Design a protein around this nucleic acid. Structure first.
Lengths: 177, 35, 138, 133
RNA sequence: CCAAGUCUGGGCUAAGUGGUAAAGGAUGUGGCGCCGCGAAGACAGCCAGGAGGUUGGCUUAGAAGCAGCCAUCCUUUAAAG
């Protein structure tokens, strides 16, 4: 949303209210613009979890946003970001999240819980074609059970930029099973 | 009493400033908070 | 930064003796956690402990995860007196590099675990930073 | 304007009935002999009484009927909950049995409707150990 | 005291800090962002019911929020607690 700059001035820039952030795209880049105030808001939403874009000179109103960056620093306040769009029908590198609900099985009865080394899902469905919020939770939880890749259950866009059997999300003893 | 490290008892015990000093106060002998 | 004699000649190849990592429960978004800023050969023991007392006060779901672990150690009095000092080991830990990803109170809505960790900081030693993660804490 | 928890078949104890009533303007002797009329049928079970006086120093009023907790236990054939609710649920029933037990509890139940009747039996069930499946 | 602007400009102190110290506390004070609303006329004041199936399970000799281990739901209605 907006964000400007692109000359050659990171220090002061990298300072005050404007944080660096390259204009990255397949084939071309352009001095870092943006700002340490927009990043906020938007970013705050869900960086590489949905997507938008800003109007700098109406130039090229396109999506893709961030494919890297960091609040690095100790303090925990980012500085020096990466930005790449995608006006193509190739959109792959697509990492969008996946949520459950709380289906009661090991929890609200066994107190047991479950780790989710997954959460996210870098795949590649129908380029410029993904439900910013995809949910899938067949339920199940408790004892020494576990679920991961393999099973899963992918809708429409048949990608899986990923593999089978691997960090899905199991149920462990928040105390003992 | 605790001179050092006072922090709210009864769901009231107030925060007062005497001599810049901060000494707990609240409807209870069981709160005579002071530092 | 004086460190030890080697990873297998003086004292290197241990378990360091402690109480493992993970606790609490999952959680996809909710980013609940703890880190620092202080530098200190984190006092093993003190360490191990601490964190633990953490579970002691909570119990189940709240990423009682914790990303620390000592692995080297000091030495001192053993032998003659003060001069040509050989070495007697004791007390390993790990450098808490001027702040960084401590342990995580990670989960949907379960501050009943935030306060926890909290109790976890209180403890510890080198001050500590109370914080949230990508998004905050819900 | 008092409230007690007197026993059955024993209307003469001085320790509880004595001080708790005499100082409130209640004749201990006469208020007791009247209980030997209605508590004689169901003697043995503690029955709470709610005496309400006026400005003449008398009356007895509403004592009761009995228990309504042990007869429900006789049908099911559980004295008590398993352990702790929402942690060891193992007592499932059915849909059709919960539907007919609420149709008679209506007098002291929330509203006279059919949708509101099934909702109370859902709250007092999961707070104990009777999951509906 | 001892030579040299009790210079001018605009902030911040109300403790003599300055004139040695850490973990640790607290509507101190001054400057920045958030959630709810004031004509569903808002927080602290004040009038009132201060609702019923809630008086569920371990322990009951007593949980029946106001011993503590598990629940955490339904409601006829001014809402729920």
């Amino acid at each position: 949303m907006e964000l400007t700059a692109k000359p050659r001035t990171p220090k002061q820039k990298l300072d005050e209210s404007m944080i660096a952030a390259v204009a990255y795209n397949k084939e071309n880049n352009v001095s870092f613009a943006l700002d340490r105030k927009a990043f906020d808001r938007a970013f705050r939403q869900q960086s590489t979890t949905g997507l938008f874009d800003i109007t700098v000179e109406g130039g090229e109103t396109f999506p893709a946003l961030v494919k890297a960056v960091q609040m690095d620093k100790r303090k925990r306040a980012p500085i020096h970001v990466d930005f790449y769009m995608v006006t193509y029908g190739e959109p792959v590198e697509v990492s969008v999240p996946v949520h459950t609900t709380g289906r009661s099985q090991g929890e609200v009865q066994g107190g047991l819980v479950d780790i989710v080394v997954h959460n996210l899902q870098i795949v590649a469905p129908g380029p410029r074609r993904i439900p910013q919020e995809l949910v899938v939770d067949v339920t199940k939880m408790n004892i020494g059970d576990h679920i991961t890749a393999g099973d899963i259950k992918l809708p429409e866009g048949c990608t899986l930029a990923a593999d089978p059997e691997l960090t899905v999300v199991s149920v462990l003893p928040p105390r003992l099973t | 009493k605790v001179r050092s490290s006072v922090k709210k008892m009864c769901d009231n015990c107030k925060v007062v400033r005497r001599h810049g000093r901060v000494l707990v106060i609240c409807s209870n002998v069981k709160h005579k908070q002071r530092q | 930064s004086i460190k030890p004699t080697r990873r297998e000649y003086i004292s290197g190849i241990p378990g360091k003796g402690i109480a493992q990592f993970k606790m609490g429960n999952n959680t996809y978004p909710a980013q609940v956690e703890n880190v620092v800023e202080k530098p200190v050969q984190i006092r093993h023991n003190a360490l191990e402990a601490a964190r633990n007392a953490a579970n002691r006060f909570v119990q189940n779901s709240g990423k009682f995860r914790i990303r620390k672990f000592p692995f080297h150690v000091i030495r001192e009095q053993d032998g003659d007196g003060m001069r040509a000092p050989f070495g007697k080991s004791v007390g390993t830990a790990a450098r808490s590099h001027g702040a960084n990803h401590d342990f995580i109170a990670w989960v949907n809505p379960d501050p009943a675990v935030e306060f926890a960790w909290r109790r976890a900081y209180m403890k510890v030693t080198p001050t500590v930073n109370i914080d949230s993660s990508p998004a905050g804490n819900a | 304007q008092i409230k007690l928890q007197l026993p059955a078949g024993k209307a003469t104890p001085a320790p509880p009935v004595g001080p708790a009533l005499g100082q409130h303007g209640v004749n201990i002797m006469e208020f007791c002999k009247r209980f030997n009329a209605e508590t004689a049928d169901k003697a043995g079970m503690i029955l709470p009484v709610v005496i309400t006086v006026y400005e003449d120093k008398s009356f007895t009023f509403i004592i009761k009927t009995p228990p309504a907790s042990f007869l429900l236990k006789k049908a099911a054939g559980i004295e008590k909950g398993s352990s702790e609710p929402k942690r060891k649920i193992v007592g499932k029933v059915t849909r059709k049995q919960i539907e007919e037990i609420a149709k008679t509890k209506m007098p002291d139940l929330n509203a006279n409707s059919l949708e509101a009747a099934m909702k109370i039996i859902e709250g007092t069930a999961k707070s104990m150990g009777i999951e509906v499946v």
